[PDB]
Amino acid sequence: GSMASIFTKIINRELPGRFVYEDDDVVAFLTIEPMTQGHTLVVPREEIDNWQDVDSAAFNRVMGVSQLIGKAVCKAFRTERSGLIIAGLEVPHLHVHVFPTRSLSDFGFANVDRNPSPESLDEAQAKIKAALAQLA
Amino acid sequence: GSMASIFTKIINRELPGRFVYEDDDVVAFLTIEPMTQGHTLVVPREEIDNWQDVDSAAFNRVMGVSQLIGKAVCKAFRTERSGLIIAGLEVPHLHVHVFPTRSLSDFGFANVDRNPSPESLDEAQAKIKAALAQLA
């Protein structure tokens, strides 16, 4: 039921996720508690945690894919900037939050959408994928 | 008295700053509006902005120093975790926010300490610098 248990099932393909990106080392998929529409989690496939202590090569791969996602969410949702957060307090598997941003109030966990509609998520997924295709 | 104005003054040493790290490419100093004690800004010397668009050489140097600062704040303030944020809505020069964290509520701009004590800043700078020497 927890955010961590659902996260684990999504990456293990034991529950459906809305993925937007996959390579040999990193995947990205939509959160179910988005700060703004398009809020994506960028995640190493291996279980590592504690961003500041992970190997620089591994961290830089993850942040490289986060850059691509940040470019995509700006394009897809028509924002000048993208926000990025690493927190780790809910799920102990490294993941980078990347989302389009319009205000400083976007940042943080108090006002996340705890119930986004399936069409909103479908739409965020499709727009990010289209943006990534244009960028590729 | 804008954040952008003050940030520029600090970088240029026109206002005093509590620097914790300096190399040829990147500097780090305590922010004047900390989310938690020890909140540090990691800043490329180069005039660049928009994290997701930054070339990988430059971005990866900033990432490396961000990890180092993250390790130092965790050690200095005895927290398991550090938070990382990139926002950019207040200051149009790339800067990564790195701070020790114990709670999701730490994240975000709604309750920064807008006028932290000289004592809190002095102790934070001292403890971070000690931790950095210890990790070197």
Side-chain angles (χ1 to χ4, degrees), chain A residues 1-77 79-110 112-113 115-136, chain B residues 1-74 76-136:
Chain A
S2 70
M3 285 296 282
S5 164
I6 298 181
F7 185 106
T8 306
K9 288 176 182 176
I10 286 165
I11 61 172
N12 293 351
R13 290 181 53 95
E14 289 172 21
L15 285 177
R18 287 179 177 88
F19 287 80
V20 296
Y21 179 96
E22 156 300 286
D23 71 32
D24 284 352
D25 300 305
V26 182
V27 299
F29 55 92
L30 298 174
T31 188
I32 69 174
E33 289 193 344
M35 292 178 190
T36 65
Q37 187 185 21
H39 180 169
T40 294
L41 310 178
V42 179
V43 187
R45 296 171 174 267
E46 68 198 3
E47 164 60 19
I48 51 172
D49 195 11
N50 311 292
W51 68 272
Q52 69 286 338
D53 289 293
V54 308
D55 152 80
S56 64
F59 187 57
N60 292 354
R61 274 194 288 282
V62 168
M63 295 302 285
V65 174
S66 303
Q67 292 188 292
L68 181 55
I69 300 303
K71 289 184 274 185
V73 303
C74 288
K75 187 162 191 70
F77 304 100
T79 60
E80 189 61 25
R81 297 181 183 271
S82 175
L84 184 151
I85 300 170
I86 313 185
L89 290 160
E90 300 171 275
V91 187
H93 183 132
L94 178 62
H95 56 292
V96 182
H97 299 271
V98 181
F99 50 92
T101 185
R102 309 171 171 81
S103 84
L104 284 174
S105 51
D106 297 342
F107 294 74
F109 289 93
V112 297
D113 188 348
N115 198 10
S117 78
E119 203 277 342
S120 79
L121 288 174
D122 288 351
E123 190 165 327
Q125 181 188 32
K127 280 172 174 187
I128 294 166
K129 287 188 169 194
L132 292 171
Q134 290 173 289
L135 292 162
Chain B
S2 74
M3 288 302 102
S5 282
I6 292 181
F7 178 103
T8 297
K9 285 171 185 199
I10 287 166
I11 274 279
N12 295 331
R13 315 316 294 266
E14 293 163 356
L15 281 179
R18 285 168 180 92
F19 284 72
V20 296
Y21 181 94
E22 161 287 298
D23 70 35
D24 290 350
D25 296 311
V26 181
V27 303
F29 59 86
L30 303 176
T31 184
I32 62 146
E33 299 202 331
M35 293 174 184
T36 64
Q37 191 187 14
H39 179 171
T40 299
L41 303 187
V42 177
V43 185
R45 296 180 183 276
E46 191 180 15
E47 294 315 319
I48 55 179
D49 195 1
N50 313 116
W51 67 271
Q52 72 282 354
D53 292 333
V54 170
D55 293 341
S56 57
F59 189 64
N60 283 344
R61 290 188 288 267
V62 170
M63 296 297 94
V65 176
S66 300
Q67 288 188 288
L68 177 63
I69 295 301
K71 285 183 190 79
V73 301
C74 283
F77 298 95
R78 306 197 178 224
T79 63
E80 184 200 342
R81 292 188 188 272
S82 170
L84 185 151
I85 300 179
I86 314 184
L89 293 169
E90 302 168 282
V91 178
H93 184 132
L94 175 66
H95 58 291
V96 178
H97 301 270
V98 184
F99 54 90
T101 183
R102 288 190 200 282
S103 167
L104 281 174
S105 51
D106 299 338
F107 291 76
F109 293 90
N111 202 29
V112 304
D113 186 347
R114 315 188 306 161
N115 186 4
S117 62
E119 149 155 33
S120 66
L121 296 172
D122 285 345
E123 292 285 12
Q125 177 182 34
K127 289 175 169 187
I128 295 173
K129 287 176 79 181
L132 286 168
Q134 209 176 8
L135 288 142

